[PDB]
Amino acid sequence: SVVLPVAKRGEDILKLIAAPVSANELNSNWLYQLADAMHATMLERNGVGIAAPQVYISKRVIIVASRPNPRYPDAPEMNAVVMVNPEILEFSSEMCLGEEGCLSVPDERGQVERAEMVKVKYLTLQGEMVETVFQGFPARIVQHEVDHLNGILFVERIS
Ligand SMILES: [Zn+2]
């Protein structure tokens, strides 16, 4: 496993709309390697999620991996999920606000309003369709990472 360089706020890579992963990439060693490098990078930076644009890869891949760590001492622990081509199909009208940081925003945290619940459809790295309901802090990570795929940093969502 390799720890990749992470783009910081102000770099233009972080402002693009990341391109969807194509059919021939699904279940490829390319794609497995991409996800493994993202995963190592996130762990090394005590992230609870990561998006491919953050590691200069303008593709629609994210990792959602809520776990307590120094950066988030109170996060619930889930098994890390890698999502290819995620699409949020439903946001709840109910809001929750929480403090977010970001691997791409050194030394700034802010309060962000997010949907309490999201329903997300995505593909596994093999290419199989999955739909999952997330609540609370995992939901906020899903929203944060999808924002990265759409060129949005959490600083822009500060109410
Ligand atoms: Zn981030």
Side-chain angles (χ1 to χ4, degrees), residues 32-94 96:
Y32 292 107
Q33 288 303 129
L34 165 70
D36 187 69
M38 288 172 55
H39 184 87
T41 304
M42 177 187 76
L43 285 188
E44 208 65 21
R45 319 292 271 241
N46 289 300
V48 290
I50 196 167
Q54 296 180 273
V55 290
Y56 300 90
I57 301 310
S58 189
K59 296 273 197 185
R60 300 183 88 76
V61 183
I62 67 175
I63 303 173
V64 181
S66 188
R67 194 168 114 83
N69 69 32
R71 306 192 45 257
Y72 300 95
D74 288 285
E77 177 167 334
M78 71 189 274
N79 302 112
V81 62
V82 178
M83 300 180 184
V84 178
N85 301 161
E87 303 180 353
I88 296 170
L89 297 189
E90 179 177 0
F91 295 84
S92 61
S93 45
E94 183 181 351
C96 64

Short mmCIF file of all heavy atoms in Angstrom, two decimals, residues 32-96, unseen atoms left out:
data_model
loop_
_atom_site.label_atom_id
_atom_site.label_comp_id
_atom_site.label_asym_id
_atom_site.label_seq_id
_atom_site.Cartn_x
_atom_site.Cartn_y
_atom_site.Cartn_z
N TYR A 32 -9.02 -1.65 -8.32
CA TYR A 32 -8.67 -2.15 -7.00
C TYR A 32 -7.49 -1.43 -6.43
O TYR A 32 -7.47 -1.11 -5.23
CB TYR A 32 -8.48 -3.68 -6.96
CG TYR A 32 -9.75 -4.45 -7.17
CD1 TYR A 32 -9.98 -5.14 -8.39
CD2 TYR A 32 -10.70 -4.61 -6.14
CE1 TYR A 32 -11.14 -5.87 -8.59
CE2 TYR A 32 -11.89 -5.33 -6.35
CZ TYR A 32 -12.10 -5.93 -7.58
OH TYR A 32 -13.26 -6.63 -7.83
N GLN A 33 -6.51 -1.14 -7.27
CA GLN A 33 -5.32 -0.43 -6.82
C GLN A 33 -5.60 1.01 -6.44
O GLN A 33 -5.04 1.52 -5.44
CB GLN A 33 -4.22 -0.41 -7.90
CG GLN A 33 -3.51 -1.71 -8.17
CD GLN A 33 -2.85 -2.34 -6.96
OE1 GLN A 33 -3.09 -3.52 -6.70
NE2 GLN A 33 -2.13 -1.58 -6.16
N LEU A 34 -6.50 1.62 -7.20
CA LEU A 34 -6.92 2.99 -6.91
C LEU A 34 -7.54 3.03 -5.51
O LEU A 34 -7.17 3.82 -4.68
CB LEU A 34 -7.88 3.58 -8.02
CG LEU A 34 -8.60 4.83 -7.54
CD1 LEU A 34 -7.59 5.94 -7.44
CD2 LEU A 34 -9.75 5.35 -8.35
N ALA A 35 -8.47 2.12 -5.24
CA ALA A 35 -9.15 2.10 -3.99
C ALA A 35 -8.22 1.78 -2.83
O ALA A 35 -8.31 2.39 -1.78
CB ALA A 35 -10.26 1.06 -4.06
N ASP A 36 -7.30 0.87 -3.06
CA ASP A 36 -6.32 0.52 -2.00
C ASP A 36 -5.43 1.74 -1.63
O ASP A 36 -5.17 1.99 -0.47
CB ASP A 36 -5.46 -0.64 -2.46
CG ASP A 36 -4.54 -1.17 -1.36
OD1 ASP A 36 -5.05 -1.76 -0.39
OD2 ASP A 36 -3.30 -0.97 -1.47
N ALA A 37 -4.96 2.47 -2.63
CA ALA A 37 -4.14 3.66 -2.39
C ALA A 37 -4.96 4.76 -1.67
O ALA A 37 -4.48 5.43 -0.79
CB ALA A 37 -3.52 4.17 -3.70
N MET A 38 -6.22 4.91 -2.06
CA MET A 38 -7.10 5.89 -1.41
C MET A 38 -7.26 5.51 0.04
O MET A 38 -7.21 6.37 0.93
CB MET A 38 -8.50 5.99 -2.08
CG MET A 38 -8.44 6.69 -3.46
SD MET A 38 -10.00 6.58 -4.31
CE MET A 38 -11.16 7.26 -3.13
N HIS A 39 -7.53 4.24 0.26
CA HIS A 39 -7.77 3.71 1.63
C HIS A 39 -6.53 3.95 2.50
O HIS A 39 -6.64 4.44 3.63
CB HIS A 39 -8.20 2.23 1.56
CG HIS A 39 -8.56 1.66 2.90
ND1 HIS A 39 -9.82 1.76 3.43
CD2 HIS A 39 -7.80 1.07 3.85
CE1 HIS A 39 -9.84 1.23 4.64
NE2 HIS A 39 -8.63 0.82 4.93
N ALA A 40 -5.37 3.58 2.01
CA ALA A 40 -4.12 3.85 2.78
C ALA A 40 -3.91 5.29 3.09
O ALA A 40 -3.48 5.63 4.17
CB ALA A 40 -2.89 3.32 2.01
N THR A 41 -4.17 6.15 2.11
CA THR A 41 -4.05 7.57 2.29
C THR A 41 -4.97 8.14 3.37
O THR A 41 -4.57 8.93 4.24
CB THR A 41 -4.26 8.31 0.93
OG1 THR A 41 -3.31 7.76 -0.01
CG2 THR A 41 -4.06 9.75 1.02
N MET A 42 -6.21 7.75 3.33
CA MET A 42 -7.21 8.16 4.32
C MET A 42 -6.74 7.74 5.73
O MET A 42 -6.81 8.55 6.62
CB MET A 42 -8.54 7.43 4.00
CG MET A 42 -9.67 7.69 4.98
SD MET A 42 -11.09 6.63 4.59
CE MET A 42 -10.49 5.08 5.22
N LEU A 43 -6.32 6.51 5.89
CA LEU A 43 -5.90 5.96 7.20
C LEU A 43 -4.69 6.76 7.70
O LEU A 43 -4.68 7.21 8.84
CB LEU A 43 -5.55 4.52 7.11
CG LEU A 43 -6.73 3.49 7.00
CD1 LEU A 43 -6.20 2.06 7.12
CD2 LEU A 43 -7.92 3.77 7.91
N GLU A 44 -3.76 7.03 6.80
CA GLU A 44 -2.54 7.73 7.18
C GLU A 44 -2.87 9.13 7.67
O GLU A 44 -2.21 9.60 8.57
CB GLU A 44 -1.52 7.84 6.04
CG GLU A 44 -0.07 7.92 6.52
CD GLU A 44 0.39 6.62 7.24
OE1 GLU A 44 -0.23 5.56 7.02
OE2 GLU A 44 1.36 6.66 8.05
N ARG A 45 -3.89 9.77 7.12
CA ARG A 45 -4.25 11.15 7.51
C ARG A 45 -5.37 11.18 8.58
O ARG A 45 -5.97 12.21 8.80
CB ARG A 45 -4.71 11.98 6.28
CG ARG A 45 -3.92 11.78 4.98
CD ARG A 45 -2.49 12.28 5.01
NE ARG A 45 -2.51 13.68 4.60
CZ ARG A 45 -1.90 14.23 3.54
NH1 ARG A 45 -1.12 13.51 2.67
NH2 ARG A 45 -2.06 15.53 3.34
N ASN A 46 -5.66 10.06 9.23
CA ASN A 46 -6.83 9.93 10.14
C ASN A 46 -8.16 10.47 9.59
O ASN A 46 -8.96 11.11 10.33
CB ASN A 46 -6.57 10.55 11.49
CG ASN A 46 -5.61 9.74 12.27
OD1 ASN A 46 -5.85 8.58 12.57
ND2 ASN A 46 -4.48 10.37 12.60
N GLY A 47 -8.35 10.26 8.29
CA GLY A 47 -9.65 10.55 7.70
C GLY A 47 -10.75 9.54 8.07
O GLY A 47 -10.48 8.38 8.35
N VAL A 48 -12.00 9.98 7.98
CA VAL A 48 -13.13 9.08 8.09
C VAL A 48 -13.85 8.89 6.76
O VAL A 48 -14.86 8.15 6.68
CB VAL A 48 -14.10 9.53 9.18
CG1 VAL A 48 -13.47 9.34 10.56
CG2 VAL A 48 -14.59 10.95 8.94
N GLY A 49 -13.26 9.49 5.72
CA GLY A 49 -13.68 9.23 4.38
C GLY A 49 -12.66 9.86 3.45
O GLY A 49 -11.76 10.65 3.89
N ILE A 50 -12.77 9.57 2.17
CA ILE A 50 -11.86 10.16 1.16
C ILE A 50 -12.53 10.04 -0.19
O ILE A 50 -13.36 9.17 -0.38
CB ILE A 50 -10.45 9.54 1.15
CG1 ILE A 50 -9.43 10.44 0.38
CG2 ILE A 50 -10.45 8.09 0.71
CD1 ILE A 50 -7.99 10.00 0.61
N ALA A 51 -12.20 10.97 -1.09
CA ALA A 51 -12.73 11.01 -2.45
C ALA A 51 -11.56 11.07 -3.41
O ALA A 51 -10.51 11.70 -3.13
CB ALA A 51 -13.64 12.23 -2.60
N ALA A 52 -11.70 10.40 -4.56
CA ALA A 52 -10.59 10.30 -5.48
C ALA A 52 -10.00 11.67 -5.95
O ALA A 52 -8.80 11.74 -6.06
CB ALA A 52 -10.98 9.47 -6.66
N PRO A 53 -10.81 12.70 -6.16
CA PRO A 53 -10.25 14.04 -6.56
C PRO A 53 -9.19 14.54 -5.58
O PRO A 53 -8.27 15.24 -5.96
CB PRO A 53 -11.46 14.95 -6.59
CG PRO A 53 -12.57 13.99 -7.06
CD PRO A 53 -12.27 12.69 -6.30
N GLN A 54 -9.32 14.16 -4.31
CA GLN A 54 -8.41 14.58 -3.28
C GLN A 54 -7.03 14.04 -3.50
O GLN A 54 -6.09 14.62 -2.97
CB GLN A 54 -8.87 14.22 -1.85
CG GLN A 54 -10.13 14.91 -1.45
CD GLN A 54 -10.53 14.52 -0.07
OE1 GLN A 54 -11.22 13.51 0.11
NE2 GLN A 54 -10.07 15.33 0.96
N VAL A 55 -6.92 12.93 -4.25
CA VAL A 55 -5.63 12.35 -4.54
C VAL A 55 -5.33 12.52 -6.06
O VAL A 55 -4.57 11.75 -6.63
CB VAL A 55 -5.46 10.92 -4.04
CG1 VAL A 55 -5.37 10.94 -2.52
CG2 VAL A 55 -6.50 9.96 -4.56
N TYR A 56 -5.88 13.57 -6.64
CA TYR A 56 -5.68 14.01 -8.05
C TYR A 56 -6.26 13.07 -9.09
O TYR A 56 -5.86 13.13 -10.25
CB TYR A 56 -4.19 14.32 -8.36
CG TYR A 56 -3.61 15.41 -7.49
CD1 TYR A 56 -3.02 15.12 -6.28
CD2 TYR A 56 -3.72 16.75 -7.86
CE1 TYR A 56 -2.48 16.13 -5.48
CE2 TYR A 56 -3.19 17.77 -7.06
CZ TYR A 56 -2.55 17.42 -5.89
OH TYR A 56 -2.01 18.39 -5.03
N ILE A 57 -7.30 12.28 -8.72
CA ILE A 57 -7.87 11.27 -9.59
C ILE A 57 -9.31 11.70 -9.80
O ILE A 57 -10.11 11.62 -8.87
CB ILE A 57 -7.79 9.84 -9.00
CG1 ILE A 57 -6.36 9.43 -8.70
CG2 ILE A 57 -8.58 8.94 -9.87
CD1 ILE A 57 -5.44 9.65 -9.86
N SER A 58 -9.63 12.25 -10.98
CA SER A 58 -10.90 12.97 -11.17
C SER A 58 -11.94 11.93 -11.62
O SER A 58 -12.48 11.98 -12.75
CB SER A 58 -10.80 14.20 -12.07
OG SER A 58 -12.03 15.01 -12.07
N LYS A 59 -12.17 10.94 -10.72
CA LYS A 59 -13.08 9.89 -10.91
C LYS A 59 -14.04 9.75 -9.76
O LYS A 59 -13.77 10.09 -8.65
CB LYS A 59 -12.35 8.50 -11.09
CG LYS A 59 -11.49 8.36 -12.28
CD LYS A 59 -12.34 7.88 -13.51
CE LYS A 59 -11.40 7.36 -14.53
NZ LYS A 59 -12.16 7.03 -15.70
N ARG A 60 -15.20 9.16 -10.03
CA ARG A 60 -16.27 9.06 -9.00
C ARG A 60 -16.11 7.80 -8.15
O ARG A 60 -16.85 6.79 -8.25
CB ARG A 60 -17.66 9.17 -9.63
CG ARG A 60 -17.85 10.50 -10.36
CD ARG A 60 -19.26 10.69 -10.95
NE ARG A 60 -20.09 11.29 -9.91
CZ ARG A 60 -20.05 12.58 -9.52
NH1 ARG A 60 -19.21 13.45 -10.08
NH2 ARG A 60 -20.84 13.00 -8.54
N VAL A 61 -15.14 7.89 -7.25
CA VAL A 61 -14.88 6.87 -6.24
C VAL A 61 -14.72 7.54 -4.92
O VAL A 61 -13.92 8.49 -4.79
CB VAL A 61 -13.60 6.05 -6.55
CG1 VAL A 61 -13.41 4.94 -5.52
CG2 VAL A 61 -13.70 5.45 -7.92
N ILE A 62 -15.41 7.00 -3.89
CA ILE A 62 -15.25 7.51 -2.53
C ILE A 62 -15.14 6.37 -1.54
O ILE A 62 -15.55 5.25 -1.87
CB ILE A 62 -16.41 8.37 -2.10
CG1 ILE A 62 -17.75 7.60 -1.92
CG2 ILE A 62 -16.56 9.48 -3.09
CD1 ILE A 62 -18.94 8.42 -1.36
N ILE A 63 -14.61 6.66 -0.34
CA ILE A 63 -14.59 5.71 0.77
C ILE A 63 -15.31 6.36 1.95
O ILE A 63 -15.08 7.50 2.23
CB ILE A 63 -13.21 5.25 1.18
CG1 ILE A 63 -12.51 4.62 -0.02
CG2 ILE A 63 -13.27 4.20 2.34
CD1 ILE A 63 -11.05 4.28 0.24
N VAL A 64 -16.21 5.59 2.61
CA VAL A 64 -16.95 6.06 3.78
C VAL A 64 -16.51 5.17 4.92
O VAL A 64 -16.69 4.01 4.82
CB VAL A 64 -18.44 6.01 3.50
CG1 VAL A 64 -19.24 6.50 4.68
CG2 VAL A 64 -18.75 6.91 2.31
N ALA A 65 -15.93 5.72 5.99
CA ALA A 65 -15.22 4.89 6.99
C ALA A 65 -15.20 5.55 8.36
O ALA A 65 -14.18 5.83 8.92
CB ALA A 65 -13.86 4.55 6.48
N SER A 66 -16.39 5.83 8.85
CA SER A 66 -16.54 6.37 10.16
C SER A 66 -15.88 5.42 11.20
O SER A 66 -16.09 4.23 11.17
CB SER A 66 -17.99 6.56 10.55
OG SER A 66 -18.05 7.27 11.78
N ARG A 67 -15.03 6.02 12.03
CA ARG A 67 -14.28 5.32 13.07
C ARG A 67 -13.77 6.38 14.06
O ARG A 67 -13.27 7.40 13.62
CB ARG A 67 -13.08 4.65 12.42
CG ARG A 67 -12.41 3.63 13.30
CD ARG A 67 -11.39 2.76 12.55
NE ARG A 67 -10.05 3.02 13.05
CZ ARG A 67 -9.49 2.48 14.14
NH1 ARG A 67 -10.14 1.60 14.90
NH2 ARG A 67 -8.25 2.83 14.46
N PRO A 68 -13.83 6.12 15.39
CA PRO A 68 -13.20 7.13 16.28
C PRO A 68 -11.67 7.28 15.99
O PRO A 68 -10.95 6.30 15.68
CB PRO A 68 -13.45 6.56 17.70
CG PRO A 68 -13.67 5.09 17.49
CD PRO A 68 -14.27 4.91 16.11
N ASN A 69 -11.18 8.51 16.02
CA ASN A 69 -9.74 8.73 15.83
C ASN A 69 -9.40 10.12 16.42
O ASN A 69 -10.31 10.82 16.88
CB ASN A 69 -9.27 8.46 14.35
CG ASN A 69 -9.78 9.48 13.34
OD1 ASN A 69 -9.97 10.64 13.63
ND2 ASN A 69 -9.97 9.04 12.11
N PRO A 70 -8.09 10.48 16.51
CA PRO A 70 -7.81 11.81 17.13
C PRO A 70 -8.64 12.96 16.51
O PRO A 70 -9.30 13.74 17.21
CB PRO A 70 -6.30 12.00 16.89
CG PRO A 70 -5.74 10.59 16.79
CD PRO A 70 -6.85 9.70 16.25
N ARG A 71 -8.69 12.98 15.18
CA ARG A 71 -9.47 14.00 14.48
C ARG A 71 -10.97 13.94 14.79
O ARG A 71 -11.63 15.01 14.84
CB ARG A 71 -9.21 13.91 12.97
CG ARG A 71 -7.72 13.98 12.61
CD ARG A 71 -7.44 14.19 11.13
NE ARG A 71 -8.26 15.24 10.46
CZ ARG A 71 -9.31 15.02 9.66
NH1 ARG A 71 -9.75 13.80 9.38
NH2 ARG A 71 -9.95 16.05 9.14
N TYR A 72 -11.52 12.72 14.97
CA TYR A 72 -12.95 12.55 15.38
C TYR A 72 -13.05 11.55 16.53
O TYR A 72 -13.22 10.32 16.29
CB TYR A 72 -13.82 12.12 14.18
CG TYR A 72 -13.82 13.11 13.03
CD1 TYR A 72 -12.96 12.96 11.95
CD2 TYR A 72 -14.68 14.17 13.03
CE1 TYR A 72 -13.00 13.83 10.88
CE2 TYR A 72 -14.70 15.08 12.00
CZ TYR A 72 -13.87 14.91 10.90
OH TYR A 72 -13.91 15.84 9.84
N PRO A 73 -12.85 12.04 17.78
CA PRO A 73 -12.77 11.12 18.95
C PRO A 73 -14.08 10.39 19.24
O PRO A 73 -14.05 9.31 19.81
CB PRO A 73 -12.39 12.05 20.13
CG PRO A 73 -11.95 13.36 19.51
CD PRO A 73 -12.61 13.46 18.17
N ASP A 74 -15.21 10.99 18.84
CA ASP A 74 -16.56 10.45 19.10
C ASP A 74 -17.29 9.78 17.94
O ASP A 74 -18.49 9.52 18.06
CB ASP A 74 -17.42 11.62 19.52
CG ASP A 74 -17.07 12.08 20.89
OD1 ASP A 74 -17.49 11.33 21.81
OD2 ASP A 74 -16.37 13.12 21.02
N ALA A 75 -16.61 9.52 16.82
CA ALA A 75 -17.30 8.96 15.65
C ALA A 75 -17.72 7.52 15.89
O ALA A 75 -16.94 6.76 16.43
CB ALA A 75 -16.42 9.07 14.42
N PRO A 76 -18.94 7.12 15.45
CA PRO A 76 -19.26 5.70 15.54
C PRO A 76 -18.42 4.87 14.58
O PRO A 76 -18.03 5.39 13.54
CB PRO A 76 -20.73 5.63 15.13
CG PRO A 76 -20.99 6.90 14.32
CD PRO A 76 -20.00 7.90 14.80
N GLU A 77 -18.15 3.62 14.92
CA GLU A 77 -17.35 2.79 14.00
C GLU A 77 -18.26 1.97 13.09
O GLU A 77 -19.15 1.23 13.52
CB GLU A 77 -16.32 1.98 14.77
CG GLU A 77 -15.49 1.03 13.88
CD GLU A 77 -14.25 0.44 14.55
OE1 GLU A 77 -13.72 1.06 15.47
OE2 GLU A 77 -13.81 -0.64 14.10
N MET A 78 -18.02 2.08 11.79
CA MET A 78 -18.64 1.21 10.77
C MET A 78 -17.52 0.47 10.01
O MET A 78 -16.38 0.89 10.04
CB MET A 78 -19.49 2.11 9.84
CG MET A 78 -18.60 2.97 8.97
SD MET A 78 -19.37 4.29 7.98
CE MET A 78 -19.81 3.34 6.57
N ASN A 79 -17.83 -0.61 9.29
CA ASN A 79 -16.84 -1.20 8.36
C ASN A 79 -16.74 -0.22 7.14
O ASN A 79 -17.76 0.22 6.65
CB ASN A 79 -17.27 -2.56 7.84
CG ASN A 79 -17.53 -3.57 8.96
OD1 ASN A 79 -18.68 -3.97 9.19
ND2 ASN A 79 -16.49 -3.91 9.69
N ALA A 80 -15.52 0.05 6.72
CA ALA A 80 -15.28 1.03 5.65
C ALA A 80 -16.01 0.50 4.37
O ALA A 80 -15.96 -0.72 4.09
CB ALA A 80 -13.80 1.21 5.40
N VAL A 81 -16.73 1.37 3.63
CA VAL A 81 -17.34 0.99 2.37
C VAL A 81 -16.70 1.83 1.22
O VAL A 81 -16.66 3.08 1.32
CB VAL A 81 -18.85 1.12 2.36
CG1 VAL A 81 -19.33 2.52 2.58
CG2 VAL A 81 -19.43 0.67 1.06
N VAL A 82 -16.28 1.14 0.17
CA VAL A 82 -15.82 1.82 -1.05
C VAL A 82 -17.02 1.92 -2.02
O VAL A 82 -17.73 0.93 -2.31
CB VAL A 82 -14.67 1.05 -1.72
CG1 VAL A 82 -14.22 1.74 -2.99
CG2 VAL A 82 -13.52 0.82 -0.76
N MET A 83 -17.29 3.13 -2.54
CA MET A 83 -18.40 3.33 -3.41
C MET A 83 -17.95 3.90 -4.78
O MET A 83 -17.25 4.95 -4.85
CB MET A 83 -19.40 4.31 -2.83
CG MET A 83 -20.01 3.92 -1.53
SD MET A 83 -21.17 5.16 -0.93
CE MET A 83 -21.65 4.52 0.64
N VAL A 84 -18.34 3.21 -5.83
CA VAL A 84 -18.08 3.59 -7.16
C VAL A 84 -19.34 4.18 -7.73
O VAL A 84 -20.43 3.60 -7.67
CB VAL A 84 -17.66 2.40 -8.03
CG1 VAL A 84 -17.43 2.86 -9.47
CG2 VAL A 84 -16.38 1.88 -7.52
N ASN A 85 -19.20 5.35 -8.35
CA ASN A 85 -20.37 6.03 -8.98
C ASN A 85 -21.56 6.18 -7.98
O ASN A 85 -22.71 5.92 -8.33
CB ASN A 85 -20.80 5.41 -10.33
CG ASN A 85 -19.73 5.43 -11.39
OD1 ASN A 85 -19.84 4.64 -12.42
ND2 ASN A 85 -18.74 6.17 -11.21
N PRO A 86 -21.27 6.64 -6.77
CA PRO A 86 -22.38 6.86 -5.87
C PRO A 86 -23.37 7.93 -6.33
O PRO A 86 -22.94 8.94 -6.87
CB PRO A 86 -21.71 7.27 -4.60
CG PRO A 86 -20.50 7.99 -5.04
CD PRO A 86 -20.04 7.12 -6.20
N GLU A 87 -24.64 7.69 -6.08
CA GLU A 87 -25.72 8.66 -6.32
C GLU A 87 -26.63 8.69 -5.14
O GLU A 87 -27.22 7.70 -4.72
CB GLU A 87 -26.51 8.38 -7.59
CG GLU A 87 -25.68 8.33 -8.81
CD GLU A 87 -26.41 8.04 -10.12
OE1 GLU A 87 -27.62 7.73 -10.15
OE2 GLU A 87 -25.73 8.09 -11.19
N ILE A 88 -26.82 9.89 -4.58
CA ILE A 88 -27.71 10.05 -3.46
C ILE A 88 -29.12 10.22 -4.09
O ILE A 88 -29.41 11.19 -4.81
CB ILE A 88 -27.35 11.28 -2.62
CG1 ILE A 88 -25.98 11.10 -2.00
CG2 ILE A 88 -28.39 11.48 -1.53
CD1 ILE A 88 -25.38 12.34 -1.32
N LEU A 89 -29.99 9.28 -3.78
CA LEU A 89 -31.32 9.17 -4.31
C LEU A 89 -32.35 9.86 -3.43
O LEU A 89 -33.46 10.09 -3.88
CB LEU A 89 -31.70 7.71 -4.45
CG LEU A 89 -30.78 6.96 -5.45
CD1 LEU A 89 -31.36 5.57 -5.70
CD2 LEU A 89 -30.63 7.68 -6.78
N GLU A 90 -31.99 10.08 -2.15
CA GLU A 90 -32.92 10.72 -1.22
C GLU A 90 -32.15 11.32 -0.09
O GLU A 90 -31.23 10.69 0.50
CB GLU A 90 -34.02 9.75 -0.74
CG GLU A 90 -34.98 10.41 0.26
CD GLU A 90 -36.14 9.47 0.69
OE1 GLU A 90 -36.27 8.29 0.25
OE2 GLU A 90 -36.86 9.91 1.58
N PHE A 91 -32.50 12.58 0.20
CA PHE A 91 -32.02 13.31 1.37
C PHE A 91 -33.22 13.53 2.26
O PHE A 91 -34.27 13.89 1.78
CB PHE A 91 -31.52 14.72 1.04
CG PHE A 91 -30.29 14.78 0.16
CD1 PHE A 91 -30.39 14.70 -1.21
CD2 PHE A 91 -29.04 15.00 0.70
CE1 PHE A 91 -29.21 14.88 -2.04
CE2 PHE A 91 -27.89 15.16 -0.08
CZ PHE A 91 -27.98 15.08 -1.48
N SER A 92 -33.06 13.33 3.54
CA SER A 92 -34.19 13.62 4.44
C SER A 92 -34.38 15.14 4.55
O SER A 92 -33.42 15.88 4.39
CB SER A 92 -33.92 13.04 5.81
OG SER A 92 -32.74 13.60 6.43
N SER A 93 -35.61 15.57 4.87
CA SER A 93 -35.81 17.02 5.20
C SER A 93 -35.20 17.36 6.53
O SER A 93 -34.73 18.42 6.71
CB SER A 93 -37.30 17.38 5.20
OG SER A 93 -38.07 16.45 5.88
N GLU A 94 -35.18 16.43 7.49
CA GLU A 94 -34.46 16.64 8.73
C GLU A 94 -32.96 16.81 8.52
O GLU A 94 -32.35 15.99 7.81
CB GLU A 94 -34.71 15.48 9.71
CG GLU A 94 -34.04 15.67 11.09
CD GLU A 94 -34.27 14.50 12.05
OE1 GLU A 94 -35.09 13.62 11.70
OE2 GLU A 94 -33.64 14.47 13.14
N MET A 95 -32.43 17.84 9.21
CA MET A 95 -31.11 18.47 9.22
C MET A 95 -30.45 17.87 10.49
O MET A 95 -31.15 17.50 11.46
CB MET A 95 -31.25 20.02 9.52
N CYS A 96 -29.14 17.74 10.48
CA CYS A 96 -28.32 17.76 11.73
C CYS A 96 -27.10 18.65 11.42
O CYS A 96 -26.70 18.78 10.26
CB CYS A 96 -27.95 16.36 12.18
SG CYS A 96 -26.90 15.52 10.99
#
